[PDB]
Amino acid sequence: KCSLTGKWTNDLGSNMTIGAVNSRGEFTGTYITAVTATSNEIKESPLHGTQNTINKRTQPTFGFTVNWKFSESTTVFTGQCFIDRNGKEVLKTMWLLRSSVNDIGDDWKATRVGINIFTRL
Amino acid sequence: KCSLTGKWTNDLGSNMTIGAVNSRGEFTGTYITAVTATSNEIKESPLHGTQNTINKRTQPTFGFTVNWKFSESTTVFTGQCFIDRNGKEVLKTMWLLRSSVNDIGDDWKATRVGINIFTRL
Amino acid sequence: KCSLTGKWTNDLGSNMTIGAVNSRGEFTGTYITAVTATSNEIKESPLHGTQNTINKRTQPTFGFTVNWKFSESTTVFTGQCFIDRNGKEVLKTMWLLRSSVNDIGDDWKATRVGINIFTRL
Amino acid sequence: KCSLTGKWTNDLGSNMTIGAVNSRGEFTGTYITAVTATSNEIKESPLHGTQNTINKRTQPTFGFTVNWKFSESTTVFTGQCFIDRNGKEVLKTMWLLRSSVNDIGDDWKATRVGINIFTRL
């Protein structure tokens, strides 16, 4: 099975624990990033997301928001669960990192984009 | 004030109602998209997200996930609330749309990106 | 007609002059950005791109690279030319801004994404 | 050295040959994609780009446009050359794929985003 519940780790070394997914596809969890651009100490951050429940797909899409507890930014992840050739689950995700800008004129430079690959711990 | 709670509409005509934001910055709501690539009839979809609570910023960043009830995809929004020159609130967001792909080999083509500007209704 | 040749201006106030498009769809030009995150003075920068010519579409897709002459970054634009409801040409583009990072470990944070809308001057 | 000139292959199996980079940082080449969403047979496609020449960086940023000869879309790549721990050259790139849409109302769904990692052949 390819279930979001459990512990995950991505290619950067970030930790991710996801709790039970309810009948509506909602789940919470904690995110421990290995990499930060801030000068603050990294701290465990809550994550909230949902997984698509249409058709009850064996590899449903999902998204979640990480509310960083040491930064003023927000990252959103979206991706899908895959059972690779071997039979091990993989989460392929793309993310957007939103920085805080003091002016709406600086908004053009506030969004970063990137990918992450999560495997089970 | 620039508060996510209330009704919003974006440049595509999509509706968005966000409920109260709790002390942890979590909020739920419903999303009614005006535009769909599916052949299904559009339907109101739940959204879940959080807004950054670090520093009590008057224009905090936020992210939320839309779990489409008529599609098998997931969209994640991230952006910031702005009080423009006049004094009207604006949400500047970028989003990722994740489609469902049956194979991990098709994963490269599953993510769309775009922007939305939300104003109060 | 919706031809890339000529002068353009986007929602940020950036200037853009595109030269003739050759039979292979290649074109050069200059880009004058109104907004910069650097402390350097902005300077006119060359751009190089091509436009798709597969079906001689009235609104072909295109892409080009801006090689900033005052920054160490690179921006790539991709979009399409549209003849809007009125009859005025519009270029709808999305871009990626690549910053220079000293280490491959910092590569995750080096890419920005955003949109631009160009109208004729 | 980390020079764009030569042959490259990415994680999808796509081929890439880049010619000499001139004093202005311009280069051409051909791109052979392993993966296509079209029903057409894949064909070698020209690419045009430039690499940043500011500061004579040993790992300068670059961008290029692929003008697909079998599709009506355009892909733009932007990234940086890295000399990894061992001594291998790696191109870390993000790309935007622009599809052709008949109407400006469909423009919201026309852009895909993704990453590619290129190693020397």
Ligand SMILES: *[C@@H]1O[C@H](CO)[C@@H](O[C@@H]2O[C@H](CO)[C@@H](O)[C@H](O)[C@H]2NC(C)=O)[C@H](O)[C@H]1NC(C)=O
């Ligand atoms: C992600 O989770 C893994 C699994 O626990 C963490 O790896 C362990 O980290 C501790 C920290 O001292 C080490 O003592 C263990 O030996 C590590 N185990 C393995 C198997 O590597 C990892 O630290 C977590 N990532 C982050 C950023 O906290």
Ligand SMILES: *[C@@H]1O[C@H](CO)[C@@H](O[C@@H]2O[C@H](CO)[C@@H](O)[C@H](O)[C@H]2NC(C)=O)[C@H](O)[C@H]1NC(C)=O
């Ligand atoms: C977004 O919300 C607005 C505000 O209610 C909707 O606009 C109304 O739509 C109804 C539908 O028949 C019309 O009767 C009203 O005249 C509209 N009011 C205004 C001020 O335009 C709009 O339909 C919503 N968008 C979607 C996609 O449902």
Ligand SMILES: *[C@@H]1O[C@H](CO)[C@@H](O[C@@H]2O[C@H](CO)[C@@H](O)[C@H](O)[C@H]2NC(C)=O)[C@H](O)[C@H]1NC(C)=O
């Ligand atoms: C983009 O092009 C426009 C058109 O020339 C520029 O607007 C002019 O800028 C000069 C600069 O002093 C003014 O004197 C003119 O009055 C402006 N004309 C209009 C119609 O606004 C604009 O400056 C260019 N953008 C950048 C960033 O250089």
Ligand SMILES: *[C@@H]1O[C@H](CO)[C@@H](O[C@@H]2O[C@H](CO)[C@@H](O)[C@H](O)[C@H]2NC(C)=O)[C@H](O)[C@H]1NC(C)=O
């Ligand atoms: C990318 O380049 C490599 C290197 O030539 C190609 O790999 C060869 O493909 C031919 C095709 O029949 C095989 O006969 C060789 O055995 C392959 N060599 C290796 C080392 O794998 C590859 O085909 C190219 N990719 C694409 C999409 O054409």
Ligand SMILES: CC1(C)CC(NC(=O)CCCCC[C@@H]2SC[C@@H]3NC(=O)N[C@@H]32)CC(C)(C)N1O
């Ligand atoms: C603007 C920038 C570059 C980013 C901001 N910093 C942060 O957002 C740190 C919070 C942790 C982000 C972890 C991302 S999230 C996606 C990816 N996947 C993963 O595991 N880690 C990364 C603010 C400052 C100003 C410091 N800097 O400069």
Ligand SMILES: CC1(C)CC(NC(=O)CCCCC[C@@H]2SC[C@@H]3NC(=O)N[C@@H]32)CC(C)(C)N1O
């Ligand atoms: C693959 C593609 C193109 C997309 C998929 N369709 C959907 O995801 C429809 C669900 C509503 C999305 C609304 C987006 S969300 C961001 C933006 N902002 C806004 O208001 N609307 C848009 C699946 C199919 C196969 C049908 N097609 O083909």
Ligand SMILES: CC1(C)CC(NC(=O)CCCCC[C@@H]2SC[C@@H]3NC(=O)N[C@@H]32)CC(C)(C)N1O
């Ligand atoms: C990392 C960051 C934020 C960006 C880098 N700066 C630059 O890239 C300036 C070069 C001009 C870019 C213009 C973009 S391009 C797309 C968009 N459309 C438009 O017209 N303008 C904008 C480097 C530094 C470190 C200074 N900062 O910090």
Ligand SMILES: CC1(C)CC(NC(=O)CCCCC[C@@H]2SC[C@@H]3NC(=O)N[C@@H]32)CC(C)(C)N1O
């Ligand atoms: C809309 C969509 C999904 C895409 C369009 N197809 C193409 O653009 C095929 C041209 C080759 C693209 C190769 C990309 S480029 C970045 C990445 N890196 C790599 O090596 N390959 C991939 C049109 C149609 C309608 C067919 N489909 O549906």
